[PDB]
Amino acid sequence: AYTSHLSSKTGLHFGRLSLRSLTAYAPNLMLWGGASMLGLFVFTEGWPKFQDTLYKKIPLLGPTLEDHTPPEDKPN
Amino acid sequence: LTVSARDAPTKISTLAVKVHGGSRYATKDGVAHLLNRFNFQNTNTRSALKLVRESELLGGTFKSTLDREYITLKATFLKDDLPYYVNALADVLYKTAFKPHELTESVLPAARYDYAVAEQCPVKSAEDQLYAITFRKGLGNPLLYDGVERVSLQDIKDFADKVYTKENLEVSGENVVEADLKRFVDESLLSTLPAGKSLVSKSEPKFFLGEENRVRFIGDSVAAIGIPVNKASLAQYEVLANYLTSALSELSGLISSAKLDKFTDGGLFTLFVRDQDSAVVSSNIKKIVADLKKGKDLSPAINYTKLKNAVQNESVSSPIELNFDAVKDFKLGKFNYVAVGDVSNLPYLDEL
Question: Miscellaneous notes for this chain (chain B)?
Fold first, then answer.
């Protein structure tokens, strides 16, 4: 028939932030969290605790990080 | 409350509420312009932002135009949204807010822009000088507000409820069902408007002939002649206006433009000759008046101006229903004259 009005809604927002932009931006900042976690995996590679807990269980880059210096040629 | 419509099997409707509220009816100088620039500001029930951002989502736009006779409130929209737009225009006519912050932030800068853009064209200057020296206090009012006499906000409210009356408006709809438009203009706020007086006068507008005015201006120079026309000889001057600009006349390369503004009680025939140097404008306007003071046979241009009148009455639907067939000859009599620009080298009315 003939439209006399405009039935609308507002939804949810708190200023500049909506939920529609949160839906549009959610998977790419999941990817950003993954990217900076890989950056942490870079920047803590010389750390020994993160080596012996995380970086030496890689199936081909595991034995690359350790010494097997014998317990014979180091003073401590 | 004359409601008229005209159906079509198409997609775009166009409503228009036209009010006899132009410059000719203005109380102070530019009150019609300021009310026109005020038109689609906020109402008492809906903001001006809410109107724009709901009309965009419903698919249509609003406009309002000013000329000497009318204030036209046009709404171009998608065809089956008509009651929204009749209530929008009814709210604009009935209840507009008239806030002084709206006067000082939107309407006065918009009007200042309109005046500054029409000031640079010397043909608009010459046209209003021509109107003002032909008709003095009716149609010769200034068209746009330029602040020579100060218009308050109460002046705009007084002009608004003087001209926004139920007898002083027409409602005209292109591509509208007429029964539904008539049902939607009552059951609306166009039924609650005051049944005032109709401001149009069926008299003759008391013209003056032989007048002359000269205006200094930097840029292009314009020489303009103007002839007031009664209701009877209207179509002879329309044939003349279409003859002088068409290729039938040898004067079409000398005339910058030529038109006939028509009203319900006569009109004004204006002719402008414009360029950048005064010698060519002086030579051309002397040739125009020396050829028009001898006769011009206007009977070749009758079918041409029949076509031109059909074309320009497709856009408007203000029909004046002119004869065109009894038009045989023209000879120039008395005429008003305006020189805008380098007026120390433009000729006077003595030399024409």
Answer: Present with 35700 molecules/cell in log phase SD medium.
Report domain extents, chain A.
Answer: 1-76
In this complex, the residue of B54, B57, B80 whose CB is nearest that of residue A2 is: B80
Structural domains in chain B, CATH included, are 1-211 (3.30.830.10), 218-352 (3.30.830.10)
DSSP strand pairing (B60-66 vs B70-78): antiparallel
Please compute Rg for chain A using Cα positions.
26
Tokens 């002359």, located at residue: B212
Cα Dmax for chain A: 94
SS3 call for B275: strand
Optimal mutation site among A3, A8, A10, interface B, most CBs of chain B within 10 A: A3
Asked if B84 and A4 come within 8 Å (Cβ–Cβ), the reply is yes
- Bridge partners for B62 per DSSP: B75
Cβ distance of A2 and B82 shorter than 8 Å: yes
This structure's resolution (Å) is 2.8
Query: Helix, strand, or coil here: B112?
Result: helix
Q: Is A6–B84 a contact, with Cβ atoms under 8 angstroms apart?
A: yes
